[PDB]
């Protein structure tokens, strides 16, 4: 099966770390030199990684039973969560550097409840299936991430959505995280898909792949023939190539920007990524901007 990407404009696609429309292409600040997102992780031959689900209806959601003290998590369908098979149930939010506000509803009952999640206390152990109830009364709930706010601890910290939470361990390896993603070098920077996230600030949530890419790749399961996939970002109305990109087998895109004030961030979002050919992982890209 020849490798393909969805023939859909980015502006009609969704973030993969929260159910939000894509609003821009971004690159990370210079002091961000690797990320370890657990959602929005899919390889080019369609292998889901981390806590990534196939569908947006599972993204940044929680399910569990509160006893007034803790919420004991399950998978979103009510199946038990198996610890030490992943850092959290599938779809569990992975937004570090903020407090979460999760809208909780119940099957068979009225009303919604705002669930406020500090991800720093020692009671936050999603990797063992338990997080603090923080006032949520006993019952079975499904919650979806609704908005975010500055982290409660450390006090006064700025929001930093380039991080993932600590899923409840004193050693990195114990939580079976998806591996980190690094810029491959030679001027290449990672490309992120940004979404505006509600809350008391100008919050921009980055992810590595739109959710519709993930379900497409998981369905296609195309053999990754090459070391890197050369892409063109194409304006669908004219067909003109707005810039070359590389998609790497681990499931991320890069580009050589030659500028953060004139580069991929300045591209329009009504464009489409088109696979061109398999190239060497060392194929040197033409810079997007000047």
């Amino acid at each position, epitope marked *: 099966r020849p490798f393909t990407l969805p023939n859909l404009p980015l502006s009609s696609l969704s973030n993969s770390r929260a159910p939000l429309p894509i609003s821009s292409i971004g690159i990370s600040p210079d002091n961000v*030199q*690797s990320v370890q997102f657990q959602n929005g992780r899919c390889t080019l031959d369609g292998r889901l990684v981390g806590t990534t689900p196939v569908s947006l209806s599972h993204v940044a959601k929680i399910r569990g039973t509160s006893n007034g003290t803790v919420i004991n998590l399950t998978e979103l369908d009510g199946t038990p969560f198996h610890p030490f098979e992943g850092p959290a149930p599938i779809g569990f939010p992975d937004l570090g550097g903020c407090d979460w506000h999760i809208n909780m509803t119940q099957f068979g009952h009225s009303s919604q409840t705002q669930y406020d999640v500090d*991800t*720093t206390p020692d009671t936050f152990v999603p990797h063992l299936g338990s997080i603090q109830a923080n006032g949520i009364g006993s019952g079975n709930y499904v919650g979806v991430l609704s908005w975010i706010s500055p982290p409660s601890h450390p006090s006064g910290s700025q929001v930093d959505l380039w991080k993932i*939470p600590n899923y409840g361990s*004193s050693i990195t390896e114990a939580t079976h995280l998806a591996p980190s993603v690094y810029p491959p070098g030679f001027g290449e920077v990672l490309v992120f898909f940004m979404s505006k996230m509600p809350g008391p600030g100008a919050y921009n949530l980055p992810c590595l792949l739109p959710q519709e890419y993930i379900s497409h790749l998981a369905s296609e399961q195309a053999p990754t023939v090459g070391e890197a996939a050369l892409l063109h970002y194409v304006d669908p109305d004219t067909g003109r190539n707005l810039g070359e990109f590389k998609a790497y087998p681990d499931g991320f895109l890069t580009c050589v920007p030659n500028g953060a004030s004139s580069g991929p961030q300045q591209l329009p979002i009504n464009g489409v990524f088109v696979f061109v050919s398999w190239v060497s992982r060392f194929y040197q890209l033409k810079p997007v901007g000047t």
Partner: nanobody, 120 residues
Framework: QVQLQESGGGLVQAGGSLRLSCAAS????????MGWYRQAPGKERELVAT???????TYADSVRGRFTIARDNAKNTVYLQMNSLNPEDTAVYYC???????????????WGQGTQVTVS
């Protein structure tokens, strides 16, 4: 593993002095604030003092002027010098630290084992 180990404490006469120290060890990327908390019989755990990595200190009202918090970033150790101890200072004292396991990961609160301080 990331671990907080407390040392010091014990019994002193009212008016006496005590020093508490807490060392953080294990593989970690950064430590933000470090602090001391305490819990007395019948009460909830409450803040005593915190110190940021720049050295900024905050104290609880009940101990301002008597307790002093200090920090040595090179050894990742936080210190509490307790002077003019009175019977209301009797509690289990806990070391606290917000630690980043790796550069990609957010902070987590870690605690020491807890050490009794008794003022007769």
């Amino acid at each position: 593993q990331v671990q907080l180990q407390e040392s010091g404490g014990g019994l002193v006469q009212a008016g006496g002095s005590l020093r508490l120290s807490c060392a953080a060890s294990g593989r970690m990327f950064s430590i933000n604030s470090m602090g001391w908390y305490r819990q007395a019989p019948g009460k909830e755990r409450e803040l005593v003092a915190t110190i940021s990595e720049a050295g900024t200190t905050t104290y609880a009202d009940s101990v301002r002027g008597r307790f002093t918090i200090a920090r040595d970033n090179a050894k990742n150790t936080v210190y509490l010098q307790m002077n003019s101890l009175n019977p209301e200072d009797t509690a289990v004292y806990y070391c606290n630290a917000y630690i980043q396991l790796d550069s990609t990961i957010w902070f987590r609160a870690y605690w020491g084992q807890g050490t009794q301080v008794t003022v007769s």
